[PDB]
Design a binder for this molecule. Structure first.
Ligand SMILES: [Mg+2]
Ligand SMILES: [Mg+2]
Ligand SMILES: [Mg+2]
Ligand SMILES: [Mg+2]
Ligand SMILES: [Mg+2]
Ligand SMILES: [Mg+2]
Ligand SMILES: [Mg+2]
Ligand SMILES: [Mg+2]
Ligand SMILES: [Mg+2]
Ligand SMILES: [Mg+2]
Ligand SMILES: [Mg+2]
Ligand SMILES: [Mg+2]
Ligand SMILES: [Mg+2]
Ligand SMILES: [Mg+2]
Ligand SMILES: [Mg+2]
Ligand SMILES: [Mg+2]
Ligand SMILES: [Mg+2]
Ligand SMILES: [Mg+2]
Ligand SMILES: [Mg+2]
Ligand SMILES: [Mg+2]
Ligand SMILES: [Mg+2]
Ligand SMILES: [Mg+2]
Ligand SMILES: [Mg+2]
Ligand SMILES: [Mg+2]
Ligand SMILES: [Mg+2]
Ligand SMILES: [Mg+2]
Ligand SMILES: [Mg+2]
Ligand SMILES: [Mg+2]
Ligand SMILES: [Mg+2]
Ligand SMILES: [Mg+2]
Ligand SMILES: [Mg+2]
Ligand SMILES: [Mg+2]
Lengths: 187, 104, 49, 159, 176
RNA sequence: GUCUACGGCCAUACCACCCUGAACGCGCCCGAUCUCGUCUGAUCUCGGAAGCUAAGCAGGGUCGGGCCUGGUUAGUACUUGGAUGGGAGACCGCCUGGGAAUACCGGGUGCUGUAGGCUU
RNA sequence: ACAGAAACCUCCCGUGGAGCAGAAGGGCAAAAGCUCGCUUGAUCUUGAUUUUCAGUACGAAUACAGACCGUGAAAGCGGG
RNA sequence: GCCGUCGCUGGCAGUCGGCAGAGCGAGAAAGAGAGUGGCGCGGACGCUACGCCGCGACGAGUAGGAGGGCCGCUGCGGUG
RNA sequence: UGGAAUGCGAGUGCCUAGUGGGCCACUUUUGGUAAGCAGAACUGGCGCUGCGGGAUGAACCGAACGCCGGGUUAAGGCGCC
RNA sequence: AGUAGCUGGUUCCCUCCAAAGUUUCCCUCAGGAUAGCUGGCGCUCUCCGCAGUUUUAUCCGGUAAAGCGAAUGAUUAGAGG
RNA sequence: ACGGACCAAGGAGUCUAACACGUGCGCGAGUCGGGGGCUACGAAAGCCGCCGUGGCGCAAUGAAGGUGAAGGCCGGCGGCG
């Protein structure tokens, strides 16, 4: 007998998309080859994200793409997001971008194209940038979800700003005892 | 009926299954709990940092100039050694040619 | 570079001692096998290697 | 069961040593504590204010807050299977500068000088400590004296 | 210590580790009867520890070597002074043996002390071993071999080859 | 050699008794108008300078007590880990490491910071 | 002097062998004890922390911070 | 030796063939580079890429969790 | 000159069942005359676990288990069974 | 189809991982909630960090032992005033 | 210790609602026609857009009255200095 524990032998991580989409898997076949047969780590990172679930592929807003693509030294680079590029009405002027995404919302396409920009698909990025050169990989906010408001210390513990689960919000719904010193205590 | 009252048997075995992890350490700790009077002034010190912004640039450039100026003035066995030299792919490239040329 | 050269080697998987042992449950100086037997390890290594 | 009293079991821990009672030497109050310092916590029963809790007696922490009379200490406390970084307020009577790091700071200064000085002299000096090595071969002179013969002594019932 | 096989006599020399106070500590020697040298050094540290403020950590073995018998082809009488612990006390004994090697006489002592007193070798401390002249021996079992014209037969010679043959037609003879 | 003021560590500095104290100090000391406080100018407070080292205080002494520090006690007592060791047990021995404390014997008897004096 | 084992006065020794509400343990000697003088920090207020702990509540406690104060010559000490 | 699991988040799209040229396992970064001047008509298998291939380690299990079933039963839409 | 040795890839987040009668052994240990008694500390076990030895046996000793061939062992043994 | 913190039962294969009888609160003691122990899903990186270990420094402690011609408490015998 | 003499067939985590997290798909600061209407399988499917009323999301906070989500520099002027 060998003295070893086996509870961590099997690493939990995706080796392929749970999705049965045949176009997603054709991209995965494409980038499986590129990740394997090139020394580019950009190809490996993209390949990994094609496996990621919906909540691990947050949408990237148009405003956030412009903000990150406006930083110095990022001119004439291709913005690459493995996800959906949503539109941000709060933006007034859209510059000329060159983006690659899995999806682009209908209204974000017109705005990007109307400004002279170009919208690629991940099969077109491979022909344009086989190794990922001249790219700017971008991600949507991962903690941008209502669920992360509810995680952490339980709401009834000191300095716990967690959001509770209440059916309705109002004066009659979990505000009396434990949330003010006047009723029992507060923390 | 009566039952067992208390024990800690098996407890250090459970504690160590996921390890007794030490607390996480960050290079910046929270200012929670520090003296309110001292924290009030520290905020005031930060609040007016920008007042001496121009002065800092002048000294830094001046300090850089002096720093750059000072720099600009200032600037086992002999057989096994030989063999280890020849066997080096780069260094012994010519030496390996010499023995090959002579061999022919 | 003993540390690197030694950790590079996998732990040697030796066979059971051919000829048996005296008593694994007591020290060498007690007529057993455990502990430091100094150069007498070589006799053991021959029977296990 | 036991009681949950704050000072249960501190009969000897917080008592003063033998013939060391009475006034507290004032140099205890003249020490300078700065943020980041390492201090050994040791409850002194003469002063009952700002007493550290018994679980912190004999632990070593780090100063993070300094007030008129006390300091804030970040000190690890193990409760069951986890270790918590705890923040305690302790009057400066019940602490002392830890000398555990002083040996290190002394070594850093010595290391840097040797590193600096050796660099200008083009030599490689050892900087890392090492565990005690097995002692090297040597000769033992007999000086013309035969080694003393020892024998076991007979038993005697010196009862 | 386990008195395994025939013991050997070892000469072990040790000392305190030199220190600033005493740059050259004195040397001590011991006669150790043991199975091997690794055991011999171990028992040395057990004896000097009992006599001196010394132990393996604060001392070293200067010399360990086997002392060979000086007259292996000559018969001698040995006197062995030893102390041992019984189930209910400690005792000093003087014993005599007839052998060719001093280490053989000591091995006879351990097997004999085990036989006659159920004494395990970890309770026996051999203090002294001397070669003794026939005139100075005390034990009647040893003195009866001090006879220049000694003679005796071998009565009732037991058959030791009792399974070759295992079955035979003739009964053995014990007279020769 | 040393003191005065303020100290740090807080007996190697304490306690008992004896001897000796140049100079300057520190004192004892002489008074109660004022400040101040008492049953009491004893103490405290105030104003002084005839006298004295008697005492405090300083240095030294004692086969001094204490205290500090070593030796011995002792590789002893105790102890971490080991054995299909012993013994009916009580307990004990050994292997691998750590390792005390009395009695008893010796040595020592304040060091020192800041400022200011005295000592040809 | 009455006055005695024990009343009150005086001198000396006295490391606490007393006292500090109470159980015990700890702490304490120009004090934390005893006696006087002035007083109400046992007041108003927001956070942090400790103890039990689930790192929840209460209870109790610790450092601060902001006001009003007391006391002291003052340093300071005090929000039971 | 064989089975499975885990790991190398390992290798294979290069079956680039007469519009040809057979390599990228090798101690030690980066090109089997491009150019400018001084007779036969032939050459296995493979690759359901959810596939195929290699190398190394490992394998107890109640309560309990998870995965995979070209395991099994009945009915519906397609298909054979 | 990543500033002791040794070994090892780590960090982090959600959701979560069963459990919440335990019991045994070395050492330490409370009550009791003691108990295969009641109650604790430490570690290791049985429970959840087969296998070689202890004739037999929850826990002892050895040793932990995919299906096999050869070899060698542990604790234990070698009159016959 | 009353309720049952209680008794009994709960139906195919293989593979992988694998407990608890402990903390606190509860008219709580045959039960729950709670933390712990488990599993699953991942994700963020990697090819500095960490450790049921030692070493070197440095603190903490009042048990084993020892002491009682040392304090407290208990206690035997003489001896000199 | 309890159930089990034997054989066949039957025999026990389901369905509705709510909630939580995970995963897959659609669209995306929006999204959803579920109620209503129009136009054998078909009680299906298709459509509506001045049918998006309405739900959830896009704003929090306070008991409430209510309020309700960056600033810096330049020049000039009035006041204090
Ligand atoms: Mg295995
Ligand atoms: Mg397992
Ligand atoms: Mg697992
Ligand atoms: Mg219970
Ligand atoms: Mg053989
Ligand atoms: Mg054992
Ligand atoms: Mg004079
Ligand atoms: Mg007077
Ligand atoms: Mg005098
Ligand atoms: Mg003396
Ligand atoms: Mg002096
Ligand atoms: Mg006072
Ligand atoms: Mg205040
Ligand atoms: Mg298994
Ligand atoms: Mg029991
Ligand atoms: Mg069970
Ligand atoms: Mg288990
Ligand atoms: Mg088992
Ligand atoms: Mg038996
Ligand atoms: Mg076999
Ligand atoms: Mg029912
Ligand atoms: Mg019914
Ligand atoms: Mg019940
Ligand atoms: Mg109740
Ligand atoms: Mg039951
Ligand atoms: Mg105790
Ligand atoms: Mg005792
Ligand atoms: Mg029943
Ligand atoms: Mg029946
Ligand atoms: Mg059936
Ligand atoms: Mg979802
Ligand atoms: Mg119909």
């Amino acid at each position: 007998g060998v003295d070893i524990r086996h509870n961590k032998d099997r690493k939990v991580r995706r080796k392929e998309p749970k999705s049965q989409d045949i176009y997603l898997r054709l991209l995965v076949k494409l980038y499986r080859f590129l990740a394997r047969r090139t020394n580019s780590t950009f190809n490996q990172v993209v390949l990994k994200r094609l496996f990621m679930s919906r909540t691990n592929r947050p949408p990237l807003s148009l405003s956030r793409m412009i903000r990150k693509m406006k930083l110095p030294g990022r001119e004439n680079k291709t913005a690459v997001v493995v996800g959906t590029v949503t539109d941000d009405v709060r933006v007034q002027e859209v510059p000329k971008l060159k983006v690659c995404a899995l999806r682009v919302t209908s209204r974000a396409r017109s705005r990007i194209l109307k400004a002279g920009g170009k919208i690629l698909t991940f099969d077109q990025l491979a022909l344009d940038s086989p190794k990922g050169r001249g790219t700017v990989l971008l991600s949507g906010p991962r903690k941008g979800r209502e669920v992360y408001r509810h995680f952490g210390k339980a709401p009834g513990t000191p300095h716990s700003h967690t959001k509770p689960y209440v059916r309705s919000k109002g004066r009659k719904f979990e505000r009396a005892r434990g949330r003010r010193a006047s009723r029992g205590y507060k923390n | 009926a009566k039952s067992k009252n208390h024990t800690t048997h098996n407890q250090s075995r459970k504690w160590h299954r996921n390890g007794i992890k030490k607390p996480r350490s960050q290079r910046y700790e929270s200012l929670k709990g520090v003296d309110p009077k001292f924290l009030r002034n520290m905020r005031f010190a930060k609040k007016h940092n920008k007042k001496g912004l121009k002065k800092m640039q002048a000294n830094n450039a001046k300090a850089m100039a002096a720093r750059a100026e000072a720099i600009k003035a200032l600037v086992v066995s002999r057989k096994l050694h030989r063999l280890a030299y020849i066997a080096h792919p780069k260094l012994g490239r010519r030496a390996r040619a010499r023995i090959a040329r002579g061999l022919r | 570079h003993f540390k690197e050269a030694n950790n590079f080697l996998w732990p040697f998987k030796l066979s059971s001692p051919r000829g048996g042992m005296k008593k694994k449950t007591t020290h060498f100086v007690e007529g057993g096998d455990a502990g430091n037997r100094e150069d007498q390890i070589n006799r053991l290594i021959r029977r296990m290697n | 069961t036991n009681t949950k009293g704050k000072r249960r079991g501190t009969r000897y821990m917080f008592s003063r040593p033998f013939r060391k009672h009475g006034v507290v030497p004032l140099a205890t109050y003249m020490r300078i504590y700065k943020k980041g310092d390492i201090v050994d916590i040791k409850g002194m029963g003469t002063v009952q204010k700002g007493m550290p809790h018994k679980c912190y007696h004999g632990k070593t922490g780090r100063v993070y807050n300094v007030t008129q009379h006390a300091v804030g200490i970040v000190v690890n406390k193990q409760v069951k299977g986890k270790i918590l970084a705890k923040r305690i307020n302790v009057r400066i009577e019940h602490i002392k500068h830890s000398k555990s790091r002083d040996s290190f700071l002394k070594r850093v200064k010595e290391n840097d000088q040797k590193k600096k000085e050796a660099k200008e002299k083009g030599t490689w000096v050892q900087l890392k400590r090492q565990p005690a090595p097995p002692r090297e071969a040597h000769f033992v002179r007999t000086n013309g004296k035969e080694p003393e013969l020892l024998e076991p002594i007979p038993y005697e019932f010196m009862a | 210590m386990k008195a395994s096989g025939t013991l050997r006599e070892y000469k072990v020399v040790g000392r305190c580790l030199p220190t600033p106070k005493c740059r050259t500590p004195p040397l001590y020697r011991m006669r150790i009867f043991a199975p091997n040298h690794v055991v011999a050094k171990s028992r040395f540290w057990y004896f000097v520890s009992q006599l001196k403020k010394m132990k393996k950590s604060s001392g070293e073995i200067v010399y360990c070597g086997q002392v060979f018998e000086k007259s292996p082809l000559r018969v001698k009488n040995f006197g062995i002074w030893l102390r041992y612990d019984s189930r209910s006390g400690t005792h000093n004994m003087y014993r005599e043996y007839r052998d060719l090697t001093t280490a053989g006489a000591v091995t006879q002592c351990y097997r004999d002390m085990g036989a006659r007193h159920r004494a395990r070798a970890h309770s026996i401390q051999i203090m002294k071993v001397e070669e003794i002249a026939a005139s100075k021996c005390r034990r009647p079992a040893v003195k009866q071999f001090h006879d220049s014209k000694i003679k005796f037969p071998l009565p009732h010679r037991v058959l030791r080859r009792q399974h070759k043959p295992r079955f035979t037609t003739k009964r053995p003879n014990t007279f020769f």
